[PDB]
Amino acid sequence: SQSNRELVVDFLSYKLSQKGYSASGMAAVKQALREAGDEFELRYRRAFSDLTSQLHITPGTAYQSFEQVVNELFRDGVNWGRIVAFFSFGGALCVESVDKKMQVLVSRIAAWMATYLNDHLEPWIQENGGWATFVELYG
Numbered sequence: 001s002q003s004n005r006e007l008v009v010d011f012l013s014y015k016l017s018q019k020g021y022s023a024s025g026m027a028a029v030k031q032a033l034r035e036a037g038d039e040f041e042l043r044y045r046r047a048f049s050d051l052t053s054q055l056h057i058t059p060g061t062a063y064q065s066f067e068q069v070v071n072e073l074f075r076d077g078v079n080w081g082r083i084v085a086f087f088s089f090g091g092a093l094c095v096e097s098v099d100k101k102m103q104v105l106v107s108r109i110a111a112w113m114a115t116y117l118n119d120h121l122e123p124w125i126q127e128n129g130g131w132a133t134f135v136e137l138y139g
């Protein structure tokens with residue numbers, strides 16, 4: 001969806017700027033997701049397997065290789081915290097890509113995240129009250 005594409009670009013731009021990199025609507029959802037991603041990274045991430053160690057992105061990486069790694073994140077179903085983890089993971093892949101002088105990968109990871117949201121997460125998001133419900137719970 002257009003709104004999910006906008007949330008992805010917003011979150012990735014926020015994370016790249018936060019990590020010392022140049023980063024060239026639904027304001028309440030964007031702010032709640034930016035803050036939840038920060039809280040996820042500070043307080044919950046280290047408990048889980050580091051998914052960046054399973055996906056080494058290069059200009060030869062296919063969407064379906066990213067899809068398989070992200071499927072591990074949702075192995076036991078979807079919840080708001082695992083969706084935040086997903087955005088945080090995309091953020092980390094972007095920062096790594098810019099670090100290794102592979103700027104082309106930032107827009108590819110953004111497209112991959114939008115595809116993954118469309119294919120696997122949007123039905124759950126709608127069923128669970130939409131991004132407006134995410135804001136009531138975590139905003």
Ligand SMILES: O=C(Nc1nc2ccccc2s1)c1cccc2c1CN(c1ccc(-c3cnn(Cc4ccncc4)c3)c(C(=O)O)n1)CC2
Nearest residue numbers: 036040048049050051052072073081082084085088089092
């Ligand atoms: O995420 C993973 N690895 C990553 N590596 C990197 C590397 C770089 C950057 C980012 C990442 S993420 C991972 C890997 C393998 C398996 C699994 C996970 C994540 N899991 C999670 C993730 C969050 C919650 C949860 C649920 N609620 N919360 C709290 C809340 C809610 C809203 N916002 C923030 C925190 C938190 C739960 C859970 O308990 O169900 N499980 C599910 C199983």
